[PDB]
A paper describes a structure:
Galectin (Gal) is a lectin that binds to β-galactosides. However, our crystallographic and biochemical experiments (solid phase experiment, hemagglutination assay, and biolayer interferometry) proved that wild-type Gal-13 could not bind lactose or a rhamnogalacturonan Ι domain (RG-I-4) from Ginseng Pectin.
All three other variants (R53HH57R, R53HR55NH57R, and R53HR55NR57RD33G) co-crystallized with lactose, but not Tris, even when the crystallization conditions contained 100 mM Tris. This indicates that these three variants prefer to binding lactose. Without this residue, Gal-13 cannot bind lactose. Arg57 in one conformation could indirectly stabilize the pyran ring of galactose through a water molecule (W). In the crystal of wild-type Gal-13, Asp33 from one monomer occupies a large part of the ligand binding site of another. Variant R53HH57R demonstrated greater bio-activity (MAC: 6.25 µg/ml) than wild-type Gal-13, and all other variants had similar activities (25 or 12.5 µg/ml) as wild-type protein.
Numbering used by the authors:
A (entry chain A), B (entry chain A): 2 to 139
The structure:
């Protein structure tokens, strides 16, 4: 891996920001690797989470938020167009009302803001992946 | 311009970070547009500056830092391979001992750290340019 995992990046996000994550799962899909991205409101991992994104490769994605320390209503999609064994590109674009999530150029979901994205102070990338790069663009 | 100018981006920099700035001068070179990039230690524009980079297009570049409110010893280079009227790409890569500055893929200078780059909390891009994008990569 080019970066440590878990990778905790301090960030300032605004509408128009794009978080681009490139990496590779460290297990084949029959071994169910996971990839997790958390948009944290502080560096402390017990802080609230504006957007939690957990992929079970070859299976499904779960999304949620954590508010006042409580996990809210979970959202899910079965569209996870990752390829077994290959590097992926995960783009999270901050729109005015939602995070748009793209996997290898394919829009899979729009997760609507329940707190403003400017409250996000740290992005954590975790679980069963090797990381090539993380970019934050405006 | 795609972004406001002056553009003040809150950042966290570490060794291995790369700041990529894409834009276009808003005047032809015979009218001496300038481009300025400041690595500020706070959002306040009177805070100390770890790395100040001021291009006079078609002429020369000045670099400096501001410590305890005082401008230090100015450094300069005449290598400024920007093209009149065209979009440029300005990359500032954070090495362990210096900032490496590349203009349109060409390394022009290495500005050595006098305070650690982790002290940089805001990057300001200013003066006579239109901005296409600013990315911070690790
Ligand atoms: O919702 C994200 C959140 O889910 C937790 O796991 C859920 C699980 O997805 C669900 O199937 C089960 O019924 O309840 C669990 C508790 O909410 C995870 O523990 C948590 O880390 C998040 O991933
Ligand atoms: O060194 C960067 C700093 O320079 C100031 O201008 C200098 C100028 O470059 C020099 O030729 C003259 O002799 O002294 C001036 C004052 O230091 C700028 O005013 C400042 O904004 C920075 O660009």
């Amino acid at each position: 891996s080019s970066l440590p995992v878990p990778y905790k990046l301090p960030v300032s996000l605004s509408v128009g920001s794009c978080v681009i994550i490139k990496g590779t799962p460290i297990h084949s899909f029959i071994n169910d690797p996971q990839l997790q991205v958390d948009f944290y409101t502080d560096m402390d991992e017990d802080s609230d989470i504006a957007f939690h994104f957990r992929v079970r490769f070859g299976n499904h994605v779960v999304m949620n938020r954590r508010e006042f320390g409580i996990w809210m209503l979970e959202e899910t999609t079965d569209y996870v167009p990752f390829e077994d064994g290959k590097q992926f590109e995960l783009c999270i674009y901050v729109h005015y009302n939602e995070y748009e999530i793209k996997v290898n150029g394919i829009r899979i979901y729009g997760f609507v803001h329940r707190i403003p994205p400017s409250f996000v102070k740290m992005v954590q990338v975790s679980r069963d992946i090797s990381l090539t790069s993380v970019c934050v663009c405006n």
